[PDB]
Amino acid sequence: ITGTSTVGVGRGVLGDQKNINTTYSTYYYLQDNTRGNGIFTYDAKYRTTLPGSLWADADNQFFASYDAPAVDAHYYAGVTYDYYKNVHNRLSYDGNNAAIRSSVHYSQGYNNAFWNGSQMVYGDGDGQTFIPLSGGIDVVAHELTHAVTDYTAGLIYQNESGAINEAISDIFGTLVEFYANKNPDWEIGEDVYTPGISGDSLRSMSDPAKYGDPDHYSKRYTGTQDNGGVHINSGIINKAAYLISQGGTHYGVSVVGIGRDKLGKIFYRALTQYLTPTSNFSQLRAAAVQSATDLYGSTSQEVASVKQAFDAVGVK
């Protein structure tokens, strides 16, 4: 909408106060004009018609319980935009400052979030498996990264290419979480998953097997559930990424860690310059090796560590 840029204040899902960029025109709308061609957050009002209505608020104060998922979807989309712009010189998900749209309060008791091809969508959770999912910065960044993937490598959402797609979203979700630097970890969704259980998460990149996901290619899922295991076999790539960044010895293979920033550079380059819609894990290894070679040189530690990490997870 046309209006003037304003700054509201509110509380997120976890009860933390934050400022949000809004737009004033009669109402204060969750429309952040400070980033690209805008970040827009919508109320799906417990229904499934999308996007719903651009979030309107009378007073620019967003402290109601109903407001909290919108506050966080809006704010964390901003953080994610900043990560891609500041760290990777990428302007929004399409590289041309496409408007970023999110809807919250999607459906009833909805234990998921997704990119629907055009926008991000967040359930509120059922209060048992999840609280409103936009409360997780890694979740928000995971979802926006799906849009980045779809505009770049285009990894088909099934089997190995789909597991790479998932891992890319977990990797950049985690790197955005570290970028914001509030309780960062290599776990996925811990801030919104299972409010009645402390210390768990939906997935772990550092130890995927803690939640039943494979951490070695020899343990990959080959069945048909979950689009051929896209959220399962992502553990193999997540583990490789964790090892590249943090190092470790895994199934006897030692990996010299090179840190998060270089992980992000290598995988961003792989995603945007080498991966294709049909890339498999072996092709991801090759893309990551080539990306590290481009960035750091063929004889570099970074290239050696990429190879070690993929070796450690059984991907040649």
Ligand SMILES: CC(C)C[C@H](NP(=O)(O)CNC(=O)OCc1ccccc1)C(=O)N[C@@H](CC1CCCCC1)C(=O)O
């Ligand atoms: C970071 C997470 C908090 C959210 C993440 N969402 P996503 O990958 O974007 C969902 N991807 C999806 O919807 O692709 C389908 C599609 C394709 C095309 C258009 C529209 C949609 C995820 O990991 N979801 C898990 C959550 C499980 C939770 C336990 C119960 C089981 C589910 C899953 O879906 O398996």
Ligand SMILES: [Ca+2]
């Ligand atoms: Ca208000």
Ligand SMILES: [Ca+2]
């Ligand atoms: Ca965390």
Ligand SMILES: [Ca+2]
């Ligand atoms: Ca996390």
Ligand SMILES: [Ca+2]
């Ligand atoms: Ca929990």
Ligand SMILES: [Zn+2]
């Ligand atoms: Zn995903």
